[PDB]
Design a protein around this ligand. Structure first.
Ligand SMILES: [Sr+2]
Lengths: 92, 144
């Protein structure tokens, strides 16, 4: 299905993030496309490294889509990341 | 490829019951219920559909943990004080574990299967971080 906006914004799900990347890396790549309301780059609970994914939230659908198309397929630290909508409107 | 994931943890603590349960269905539907804050009479119950990339990362985290190769037979059983349940289907493989609330570094180290119990502990914690982030940011609520 299509993108489902969250309560106060639009959230993208970022995957295949280098394990040594930190919020800095995410901020650096994503800020250009809009003001970032939140970044959750969760750490692996056993290692302390990034677990490989992040939720990145923008204030508008415009910003999130700009980032999406600009960053899906880009690289952080030599590792290609994928950028998708985090939530969708319906099943299957 | 068939997929399903459900985790439940419940307990009777000095200050009363408490439970948290979430489920990801093959259609991307995430269902979440958490009544872990006993200082209030409400509960958190939410659902949302997540994008396939989320379901794929979930599978990735589960595969990498190697939990699908574990067995709960030698694990402590659930007791009158705590219980955890973890059910997963990935393609052909399925597992269903039921055990007590996870004890200390000490308890796990002296159990019959310290390696398997640690694997279970860290996977559950990683799944919780992902679920808490999803619910929390999407609904702009504490997931608690
Ligand atoms: Sr409550």
């Amino acid at each position: 299905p299509g993108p489902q906006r969250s309560v106060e914004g639009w959230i993208l799900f970022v995957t295949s993030i280098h394990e040594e990347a930190q919020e800095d890396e995410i901020q650096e790549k994503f800020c250009d496309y809009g003001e970032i309301k939140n970044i959750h780059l969760n750490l692996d609970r056993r290692t302390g490294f990034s677990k490989g994914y992040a939720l990145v939230e923008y204030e508008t659908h415009k910003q999130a889509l700009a980032a999406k198309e600009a960053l899906n397929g880009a690289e952080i630290m030599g590792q290609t990341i994928q950028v998708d909508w985090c939530f969708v409107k319906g099943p299957k | 490829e068939d997929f399903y994931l459900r985790y439940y943890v419940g307990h009777k603590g000095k200050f009363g019951h408490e439970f948290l349960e979430f489920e990801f269905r093959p259609d991307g539907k995430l269902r979440y219920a958490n009544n872990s804050n006993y200082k209030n009479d409400t509960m958190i119950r939410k659902e949302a559909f997540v994008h396939q990339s989320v379901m794929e990362e979930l599978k990735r985290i589960i595969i990498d943990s190697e939990i699908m190769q574990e067995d709960d037979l030698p694990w402590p059983p659930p007791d009158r004080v705590g219980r955890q349940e973890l059910e997963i289907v990935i393609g052909d493989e399925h597992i269903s574990f039921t055990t007590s609330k996870t004890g200390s570094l000490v308890d796990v180290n002296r159990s019959k299967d310290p390696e398997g119990l640690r694997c279970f502990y860290y996977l559950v914690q990683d799944l919780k971080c992902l679920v808490f982030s999803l619910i929390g940011l999407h609904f702009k609520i504490k997931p608690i």
